Amino acid sequence: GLLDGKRILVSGIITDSSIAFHIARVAQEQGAQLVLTGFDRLRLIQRITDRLPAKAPLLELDVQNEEHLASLAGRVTEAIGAGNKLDGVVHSIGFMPQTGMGINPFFDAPYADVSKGIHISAYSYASMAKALLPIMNPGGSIVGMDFDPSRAMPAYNWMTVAKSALESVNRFVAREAGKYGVRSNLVAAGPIRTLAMSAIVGGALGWDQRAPIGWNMKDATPVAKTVCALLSDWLPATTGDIIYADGGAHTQLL
Amino acid sequence: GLLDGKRILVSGIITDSSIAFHIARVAQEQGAQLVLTGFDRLRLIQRITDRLPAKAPLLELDVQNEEHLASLAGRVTEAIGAGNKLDGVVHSIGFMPQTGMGINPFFDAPYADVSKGIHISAYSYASMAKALLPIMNPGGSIVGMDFDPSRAMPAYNWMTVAKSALESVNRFVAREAGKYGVRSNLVAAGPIRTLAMSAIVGGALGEEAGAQIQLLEEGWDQRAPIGWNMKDATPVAKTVCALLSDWLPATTGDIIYADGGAHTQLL
Amino acid sequence: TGLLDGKRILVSGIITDSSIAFHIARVAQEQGAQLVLTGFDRLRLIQRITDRLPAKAPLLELDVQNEEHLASLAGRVTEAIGAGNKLDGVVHSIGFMPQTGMGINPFFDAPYADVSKGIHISAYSYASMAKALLPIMNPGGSIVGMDFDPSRAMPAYNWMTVAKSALESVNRFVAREAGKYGVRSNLVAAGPIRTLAMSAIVGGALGEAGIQLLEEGWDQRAPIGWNMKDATPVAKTVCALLSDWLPATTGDIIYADGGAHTQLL
Amino acid sequence: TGLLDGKRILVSGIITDSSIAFHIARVAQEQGAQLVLTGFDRLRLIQRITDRLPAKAPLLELDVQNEEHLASLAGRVTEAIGAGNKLDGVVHSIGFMPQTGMGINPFFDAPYADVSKGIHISAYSYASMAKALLPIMNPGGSIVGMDFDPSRAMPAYNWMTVAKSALESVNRFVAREAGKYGVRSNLVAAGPIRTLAMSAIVGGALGEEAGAQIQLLEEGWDQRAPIGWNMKDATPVAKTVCALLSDWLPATTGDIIYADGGAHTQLL
Numbered sequence A: 001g002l003l004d005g006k007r008i009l010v011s012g013i014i015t016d017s018s019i020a021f022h023i024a025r026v027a028q029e030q031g032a033q034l035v036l037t038g039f040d041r042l043r044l045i046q047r048i049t050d051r052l053p054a055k056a057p058l059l060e061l062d063v064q065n066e067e068h069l070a071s072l073a074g075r076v077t078e079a080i081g082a083g084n085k086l087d088g089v090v091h092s093i094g095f096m097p098q099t100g101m102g103i104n105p106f107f108d109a110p111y112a113d114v115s116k117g118i119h120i121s122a123y124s125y126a127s128m129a130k131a132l133l134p135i136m137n138p139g140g141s142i143v144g145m146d147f148d149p150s151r152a153m154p155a156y157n158w159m160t161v162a163k164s165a166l167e168s169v170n171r172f173v174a175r176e177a178g179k180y181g182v183r184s185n186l187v188a189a190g191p192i193r194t195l196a197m198s199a200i201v202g203g204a205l206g207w208d209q210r211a212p213i214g215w216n217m218k219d220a221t222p223v224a225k226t227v228c229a230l231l232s233d234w235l236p237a238t239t240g241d242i243i244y245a246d247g248g249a250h251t252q253l254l
Numbered sequence B: 001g002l003l004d005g006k007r008i009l010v011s012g013i014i015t016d017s018s019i020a021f022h023i024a025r026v027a028q029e030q031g032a033q034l035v036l037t038g039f040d041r042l043r044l045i046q047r048i049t050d051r052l053p054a055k056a057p058l059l060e061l062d063v064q065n066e067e068h069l070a071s072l073a074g075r076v077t078e079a080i081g082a083g084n085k086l087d088g089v090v091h092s093i094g095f096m097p098q099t100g101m102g103i104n105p106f107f108d109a110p111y112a113d114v115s116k117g118i119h120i121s122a123y124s125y126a127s128m129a130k131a132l133l134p135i136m137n138p139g140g141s142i143v144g145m146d147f148d149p150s151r152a153m154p155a156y157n158w159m160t161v162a163k164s165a166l167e168s169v170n171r172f173v174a175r176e177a178g179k180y181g182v183r184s185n186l187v188a189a190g191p192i193r194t195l196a197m198s199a200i201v202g203g204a205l206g207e208e209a210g211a212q213i214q215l216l217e218e219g220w221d222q223r224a225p226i227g228w229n230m231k232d233a234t235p236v237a238k239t240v241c242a243l244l245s246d247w248l249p250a251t252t253g254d255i256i257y258a259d260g261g262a263h264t265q266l267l
Numbered sequence C: 001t002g003l004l005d006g007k008r009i010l011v012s013g014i015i016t017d018s019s020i021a022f023h024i025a026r027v028a029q030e031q032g033a034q035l036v037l038t039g040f041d042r043l044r045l046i047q048r049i050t051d052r053l054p055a056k057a058p059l060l061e062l063d064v065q066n067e068e069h070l071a072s073l074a075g076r077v078t079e080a081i082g083a084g085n086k087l088d089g090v091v092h093s094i095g096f097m098p099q100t101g102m103g104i105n106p107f108f109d110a111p112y113a114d115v116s117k118g119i120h121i122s123a124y125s126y127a128s129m130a131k132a133l134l135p136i137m138n139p140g141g142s143i144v145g146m147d148f149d150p151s152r153a154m155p156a157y158n159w160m161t162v163a164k165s166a167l168e169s170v171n172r173f174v175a176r177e178a179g180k181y182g183v184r185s186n187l188v189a190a191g192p193i194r195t196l197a198m199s200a201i202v203g204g205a206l207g208e209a210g211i212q213l214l215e216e217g218w219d220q221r222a223p224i225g226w227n228m229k230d231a232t233p234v235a236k237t238v239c240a241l242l243s244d245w246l247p248a249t250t251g252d253i254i255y256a257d258g259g260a261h262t263q264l265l
Numbered sequence D: 001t002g003l004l005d006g007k008r009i010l011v012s013g014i015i016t017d018s019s020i021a022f023h024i025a026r027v028a029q030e031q032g033a034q035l036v037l038t039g040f041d042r043l044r045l046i047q048r049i050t051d052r053l054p055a056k057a058p059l060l061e062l063d064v065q066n067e068e069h070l071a072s073l074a075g076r077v078t079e080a081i082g083a084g085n086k087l088d089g090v091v092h093s094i095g096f097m098p099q100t101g102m103g104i105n106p107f108f109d110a111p112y113a114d115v116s117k118g119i120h121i122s123a124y125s126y127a128s129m130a131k132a133l134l135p136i137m138n139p140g141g142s143i144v145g146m147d148f149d150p151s152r153a154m155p156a157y158n159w160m161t162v163a164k165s166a167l168e169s170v171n172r173f174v175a176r177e178a179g180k181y182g183v184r185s186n187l188v189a190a191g192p193i194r195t196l197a198m199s200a201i202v203g204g205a206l207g208e209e210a211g212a213q214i215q216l217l218e219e220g221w222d223q224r225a226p227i228g229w230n231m232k233d234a235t236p237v238a239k240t241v242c243a244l245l246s247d248w249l250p251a252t253t254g255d256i257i258y259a260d261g262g263a264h265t266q267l268l
């Protein structure tokens, strides 16, 4: 398997549509041993993770909770056994209050709302790296999820700003991670039908055409595969960077 | 008179080294009628602005103060006369706490500090646009100051993240401003000796900050095909004035680099 | 009082009064510049066109594929602007790609001889012109070329996109050379404008063409809108770069496209 | 151990055992790929070099400026892999620029005939090879070319930088064509590697300003790379190419993957 013998933490499962769920499934199919983290509704999340190919410890992690972050490494070590470390970490976490999204006027989002979104969607990438690098092996890999924010667009509004911040954060996390022999990268995914897409983006409210190899919004697997590629030993010279799993859409104007 | 008859708001003057001070000076040399905004040290800033070529009204603006923002357009209108609107707005404002800068570990900056910096340095570009677009004329121009954050680097740390956010904010402000026939752009400047350079950046570099800033300039000037002088804000001020003028009428949501060309060269 | 008062500027690329170069020339003269013009092939026609400008400027022949023309260029310019005078600006507004390299013609079917001709005229010649003219430019001077953002592929532009990608790279190296003379080098990436090249080269290779959709999409993306029939905003931007008001910008690209490239949709 | 198990892959660009293409071929074979190799001009030497690979692989002649070679390529490949079989992968690891276009030679003094030859071999031929080989590629297939980030100018690289800028653009159009076949096209932008191609850049540069500039660029690369950069180690670049050849980056095309230690993401 691509990830045989690798110990990987995966955050961000909320439903079986979650990009993180597919990342977890594919990683398990590829031999990885997982530690999962979930936010808020852990009982409900556990029922979802029970549907994964293999058993995995589920740990609670609210990235705005300083104690959760402080205790994370210790709780992970308890789950994987003393003397063992992680080889991979997946940040698949985002949030933005409704005022910062959709048809709500860009100028009307209060800073308190924007700040919450940036905390959860961007700063927390640094928080998780801070918490977990001390228990990561050399050759390890941290991967976060991105949506190309290089151009403005309808609806994505302040989440675009949060992703621009996340890209910059990733470049600095790479400088820290390199001290541990660890890579840090983002995967910029095209649109996928997830809860966030439905409840956050859709609640607040061309890709296949542009993508030379097409794009299926109902299929998170190609994105999951791309994350697994970064978690593997097969992109060993790439860090601080962004890999686009978007069908090539961002490389085409029409 | 590049800006003859234009009414332009300029924020960000704190000393006569401020990039905003030179923007104001050059704009007045080019015929602009200014309204200035200052933060915190209003008595001192008034003395500074007395050193500008022409008299200009000074208004208080703390961009974290909701009341200041809510009253801003009315206060500007009082300053320029009823029925008159602005043709230009200059955002030349930033802040980051020391924990977010320099040799202080990147991971050790608390979010409260990072958030304050992002509020002042990035969100406030949207706040200022929100406040002032209702009193801007078609053909108008909003300009903010940037430092190219497309790559990470020593010391700039969380301010790099704030500038990355600011660039994104600018692209959305352009969408809103277009409804008013107004452009929104950033000028990404090379390093200039200002109070922020000395007190924020320099303060966080530890001992021999002076030598490190000298080395930064040396590298920048080497990389820049036309060279770079960190003691001279005039080239940056002229660039901002170009964007405030009628001579870049088809540019919006964009970034103009006033950096000697350094960002175009690897070595 | 003009933006370009007292400046001596060479402008290449006029073929009709719709040429981007024609509008650049017009605005530059309105702003006090003294021009020397260069033209390719149809010189008598070009002379008739330039009789429509505010002031009649000398026209020099320049086929950028002709080594003899390039070798004699600086001397001919100096005679036209008067010995003792140097240039303050140079405008490269030149491009070409054979039909095989454009439109609905298959990308893979363009022979290298055709692609190479297009790259010679559209990209290499920016270096050729800088080589010829830098020795007669004043410090503070400005070389400007015309670009069309090639960072993403698109229908129809095909191999011209490749030539523009090459041109952007050439510009960054010309900036290194030009800096030795205190001269800036930059490109203006313009949105779509109804010119002879748009009609004859682009439109011609589109076959059964009538571009309307291109205009509508561009104007929709551009937060301040975009008018394909109006070259003036592009001409103004070029004049900004020729002026003293962007003195710290070189090796760069300024986008005069209504902001379209900053918006996804 | 089997990243490319069962995949048939063409690898161009081996001239020495220091060639990036040699290491690509080596790593691909380690991962189960069945290769066909192509070489230019010195075919006897290249055959002896390719005998040093972990497994045997047929060698074909290909001068990318030779229209006849390109026209016969698909048929010669099919002869090598057997009728009814197709390629799953293609590696373009080919570059050339005449001496006038590189190094201490002034940028303005390179004649267009020289620049054009370099662009022909280094950029246009990516399209040439895709045109020839797409009709014999399977869906899910992958074409990969080698890039050196040309987004900023730099000392010595001169007209090759222009050729790479052209190659990046070509790749985006090749992706449009390749997509019709269900095939991806991407470039790997590698950091500097001490292949025997280095003399093309540093040749004659000692004592000249360019000499120190080239070394400064190389040392700066390792400095900027958050995980460091070893110019003597082609393996990480080879692995990256293999990742693109694999089934594990199925949604990436018209794109550039940077195998450079992360250096391009850091200003200092």
Ligand SMILES: NC(=O)c1ccc[n+]([C@@H]2O[C@H](COP(=O)([O-])OP(=O)(O)OC[C@H]3O[C@@H](n4cnc5c(N)ncnc54)[C@H](O)[C@@H]3O)[C@@H](O)[C@H]2O)c1
Pocket (backbone or CB within 6 Å): A011, A012, A013, A014, A015, A017, A018, A019, A020, A038, A039, A061, A062, A063, A064, A091, A092, A093, A094, A095, A120, A145, A146, A147, A188, A189, A190, A191, A192, A193, A194, A195, A196, A197
């Ligand atoms: N769905 C898409 O189209 C798409 C495209 C590109 C990038 N992304 C990114 O992928 C990642 C996952 O999003 P998704 O589309 O799978 O939607 P999702 O709703 O399935 O996952 C989002 C996750 O964020 C978690 N989260 C929110 N606040 C948290 C907190 N305070 N602490 C810890 N976790 C918290 C949620 O609990 C949830 O599991 C995000 O970074 C998102 O921006 C999604």
Ligand SMILES: NC(=O)c1ccc[n+]([C@@H]2O[C@H](COP(=O)([O-])OP(=O)(O)OC[C@H]3O[C@@H](n4cnc5c(N)ncnc54)[C@H](O)[C@@H]3O)[C@@H](O)[C@H]2O)c1
Pocket (backbone or CB within 6 Å): B011, B012, B013, B014, B015, B017, B018, B019, B020, B038, B039, B061, B062, B063, B064, B091, B092, B093, B094, B095, B120, B145, B146, B147, B188, B189, B190, B191, B192, B193, B194, B195, B196, B197
């Ligand atoms: N100095 C450089 O090298 C350089 C380079 C590129 C970009 N910039 C940018 O230029 C701009 C001006 O910086 P400067 O270098 O002229 O330094 P400066 O210290 O002269 O100006 C910074 C300004 O921010 C103002 N400010 C801070 N908090 C504020 C608040 N809550 N409300 C309103 N104003 C507030 C300060 O009072 C001051 O006037 C900033 O955006 C900075 O990041 C500076």
Ligand SMILES: NC(=O)c1ccc[n+]([C@@H]2O[C@H](COP(=O)([O-])OP(=O)(O)OC[C@H]3O[C@@H](n4cnc5c(N)ncnc54)[C@H](O)[C@@H]3O)[C@@H](O)[C@H]2O)c1
Pocket (backbone or CB within 6 Å): C012, C013, C014, C015, C016, C018, C019, C020, C021, C039, C040, C062, C063, C064, C065, C092, C093, C094, C095, C096, C121, C146, C147, C148, C189, C190, C191, C192, C193, C194, C195, C196, C197, C198
């Ligand atoms: N029209 C647009 O939409 C548009 C948009 C962006 C950039 N551009 C660029 O603007 C510039 C001018 O193009 P235009 O649109 O005004 O079309 P145009 O047809 O009016 O001008 C093109 C010019 O190229 C000149 N030229 C061709 N071969 C030459 C040679 N061998 N030597 C010297 N000159 C030669 C022609 O004579 C002509 O004057 C080009 O670089 C073009 O790619 C055009």
Ligand SMILES: NC(=O)c1ccc[n+]([C@@H]2O[C@H](COP(=O)([O-])OP(=O)(O)OC[C@H]3O[C@@H](n4cnc5c(N)ncnc54)[C@H](O)[C@@H]3O)[C@@H](O)[C@H]2O)c1
Pocket (backbone or CB within 6 Å): D012, D013, D014, D015, D016, D018, D019, D020, D021, D039, D040, D062, D063, D064, D065, D092, D093, D094, D095, D096, D121, D146, D147, D148, D189, D190, D191, D192, D193, D194, D195, D196, D197
């Ligand atoms: N070595 C580096 O640091 C580096 C870094 C990034 C990218 N690259 C790229 O990697 C690729 C291989 O470079 P390398 O360093 O392994 O050098 P190399 O000399 O080992 O390989 C270059 C290959 O091009 C082949 N070639 C030249 N003309 C040809 C023609 N007419 N037809 C077919 N093949 C031809 C040569 O025979 C040779 O095998 C090139 O595209 C190069 O630009 C090299």
Ligand SMILES: CCCCCCc1ccc(Oc2ccccc2Br)c(O)c1
Pocket (backbone or CB within 6 Å): A093, A094, A095, A096, A146, A147, A153, A154, A155, A156, A159, A190, A191, A192, A194, A196, A197, A200, A201
């Ligand atoms: C122009 C249309 C924009 C749709 C983009 C697709 C998309 C959907 C959900 C995302 O996940 C989130 C989006 C917003 C807040 C939180 C999360 Br998780 C995300 O990052 C990106």
Ligand SMILES: CCCCCCc1ccc(Oc2ccccc2Br)c(O)c1
Pocket (backbone or CB within 6 Å): B093, B094, B095, B096, B146, B147, B154, B155, B156, B159, B190, B191, B192, B196, B197, B200, B201, B216
């Ligand atoms: C050695 C690190 C590189 C920085 C050099 C240039 C510079 C200096 C001051 C700035 O102004 C600020 C910098 C940080 C916070 C607030 C302000 Br205003 C700024 O944006 C950029």
Ligand SMILES: CCCCCCc1ccc(Oc2ccccc2Br)c(O)c1
Pocket (backbone or CB within 6 Å): C094, C095, C096, C097, C147, C148, C155, C156, C157, C160, C191, C192, C193, C197, C198, C201, C202, C214
């Ligand atoms: C749907 C197709 C896209 C058209 C874009 C607009 C445009 C038109 C003409 C141009 O000028 C030329 C275009 C090609 C060859 C020569 C010249 Br000059 C140019 O650069 C760009």
Ligand SMILES: CCCCCCc1ccc(Oc2ccccc2Br)c(O)c1
Pocket (backbone or CB within 6 Å): D094, D095, D096, D097, D102, D147, D148, D154, D155, D156, D157, D160, D191, D192, D193, D197, D198, D200, D201, D214, D217
């Ligand atoms: C100042 C820059 C120093 C580092 C450059 C690394 C490098 C070396 C050889 C290359 O391959 C070639 C470069 C030129 C001609 C032929 C070939 Br193969 C190439 O693309 C890139």
